[PDB]
Amino acid sequence: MNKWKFLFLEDSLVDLELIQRQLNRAKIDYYPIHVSDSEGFSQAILDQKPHLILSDFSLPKYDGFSALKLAKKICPTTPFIFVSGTYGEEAAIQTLTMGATDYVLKDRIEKLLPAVQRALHELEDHELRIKAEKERYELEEQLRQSQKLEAMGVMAGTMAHEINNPLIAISEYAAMIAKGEVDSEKAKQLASKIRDESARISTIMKNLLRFSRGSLYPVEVGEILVKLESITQQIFKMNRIDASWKNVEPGHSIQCREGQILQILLNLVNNAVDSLNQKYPEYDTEKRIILENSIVEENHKKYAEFSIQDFGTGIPIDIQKSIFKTFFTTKSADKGTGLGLSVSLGIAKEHGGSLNFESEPGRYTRFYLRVPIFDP
Amino acid sequence: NKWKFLFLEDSLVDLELIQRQLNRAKIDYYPIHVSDSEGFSQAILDQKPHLILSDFSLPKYDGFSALKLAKKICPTTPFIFVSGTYGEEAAIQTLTMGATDYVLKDRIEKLLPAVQRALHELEDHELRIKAEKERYELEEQLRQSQKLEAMGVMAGTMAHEINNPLIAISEYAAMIAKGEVDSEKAKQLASKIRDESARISTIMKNLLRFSRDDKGSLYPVEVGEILVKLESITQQIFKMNRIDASWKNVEPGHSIQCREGQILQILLNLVNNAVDSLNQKYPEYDTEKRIILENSIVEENHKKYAEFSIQDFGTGIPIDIQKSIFKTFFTTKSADKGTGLGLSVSLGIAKEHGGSLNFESEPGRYTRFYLRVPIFDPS
């Protein structure tokens, strides 16, 4: 609502006005929270979560020694600055040793602004560091999508080049028949050649598709979950996503290409992060993701179900039937290739599994991959 | 691991007692023995021991002075006192002075747990690096696999959009070949064959335009933004591969008409080739596993160009293949680690920018690739 949140523990309305006047001269955008006792101070820290505490030493019923001791217990990372008129500088330095972040004397109120600015500058710097890491990650991901598109482009080019020669032959033979440049008997021969060139195009593509494409082996389900956790923890941290796990079922193995199963799961996670960042551009308590594994039984067969539930935008009903189609994306093409869900569905079927989803618009989306357990 | 243990001890008899306890444990260590301050000081600097075991009372030298020096020169090296000169009440105090552990000579059985804990802490640090390296390798393996998967999906989609007209061509051709149609229907069917062949060409053109035309107009970009982004992306690459990366020159304040993302793709492609060449030549840590990254302004044919240069000292490029690199799908790496597309895409991108991509290499010594892009200057 308001950028900074400042907690003032102060009993003098006159001194509060003096302190605030110095901050307002700087056009600092802060939300003031004023408290004069231990209950208000204790409640305001927990419920309001201030980014900075400014405390008086002497309040009726409350003291800055107790306030500092409470702050070190409840909000250790929050900067705490004393601003008091009850002692000199000799006494004030000692308070820093007690773990105050800074100390401002009321008779030297000009010192308040540098103390506040340093604390705010340090807070911004911490935010700036996380942001630079997020931007670096996004740039790395854009380059990776671009390298993927170039390889697709090279494959489209090579297949077009090997096909155009027989395609030309088809057009010349058809043109000779259509032009009437051939007797009835040559037209049958040319029509035979057209069939052979059409069969050639189908074979060239088959040899190419086989060139562009390991055996399944038993893999422990737990090995997959540890790898998925290990890969996505940093993604959630960079995106400030809260990640919850509800259940696991290791000690069951599946016949899979482990790398391809992890590829499915990673694609769903990427869809969840994009959905979450679109709904919650800043930090929000509802920017959460649920990751679960479970054993499911279907048609008297047991399956390992991997589930990824995000609380982002959900999938609008008009597009929900069209989401596994190749190249379908609602993101601007610069950020979305539309290949994630279609590749994951292809891989899932190759493993004898299924990929399905449930979503309620504006609430959640849950994608789940089921793969049959290998029982020897 | 071949640990290196520095022993500051003046009694050869007590040294044999200490070493005998470690040798019973089959601890693989290299002993370094010193009895004075000069030998102790040199051994820390020159040999870089992984553990220091020190006596308190050596003639001409003392463990208080040893601790103070160790804290100045090798603060992170574990330091365990092993002395016969005092009791446990005095020994506990030595830990407060920053000894890692204290072993009494009369209780030499306590030496092994102190050493094992110190070695385990070193191993744990090595284990952490290994787990991070393995995680990074798996992420790169998954990304390479996804690139191969995308190529397969594009090959599949073009086959699906083409097969419908291919079926029609084959059916129409079959009716003509059987003679089941008069001469006028055969000409009409031949026209349909022509129309379906043109359709296949159009389907392919629309697919190729999505794969090679969603690129963007050229815009002026400042050279320095490209260099900072390249630095930020490759810092982690060099750290994971234990590559020493040096920059010889930069030339910001010059701009080029480019697709910034495509320029970074060239440079990143050259970097990946350097890392692979370097990893093939130096599988372990080596001081010559170095990379030189430079930018400069170059003049060619009375035109000024921004040159980005990447020089690795890895596996030189053999003369027989030097003439063939940059060809589409040419790779000497296995399929698990190479598609052969990096240099061919980079040469295309360089030409689309009015630039060139070139290289110099001496076999067994170094390779230098350099990308030239024209400076944007209306004047």
Ligand SMILES: Nc1ncnc2c1ncn2[C@@H]1O[C@H](COP(=O)(O)OP(=O)(O)CP(=O)(O)O)[C@@H](O)[C@H]1O
């Ligand atoms: N968790 C999620 N939340 C909201 N929408 C989602 C979603 N997962 C998928 N979608 C929708 O389905 C579409 C299909 O996405 P898909 O993964 O197939 O391609 P993509 O647009 O995500 C780029 P990429 O192929 O690189 O993953 C998305 O563009 C989006 O509109």
Ligand SMILES: Nc1ncnc2c1ncn2[C@@H]1O[C@H](COP(=O)(O)OP(=O)(O)CP(=O)(O)O)[C@@H](O)[C@H]1O
């Ligand atoms: N710095 C370098 N040192 C040694 N050989 C190099 C090299 N740069 C390129 N090469 C050689 O040229 C080949 C072409 O590399 P290119 O990048 O085009 O495809 P690639 O083999 O590296 C797999 P990818 O297409 O995924 O990058 C390499 O496989 C390698 O044999």
Ligand code: BEF
């Ligand atoms: F009451 Be306070 F210490 F200014």
Ligand code: BEF
């Ligand atoms: F001489 Be030592 F300190 F055992």
Ligand SMILES: [Mg+2]
């Ligand atoms: Mg007061």
Ligand SMILES: [Mg+2]
């Ligand atoms: Mg996706």
Ligand SMILES: [Mg+2]
């Ligand atoms: Mg001695």
Ligand SMILES: [Mg+2]
């Ligand atoms: Mg390469």
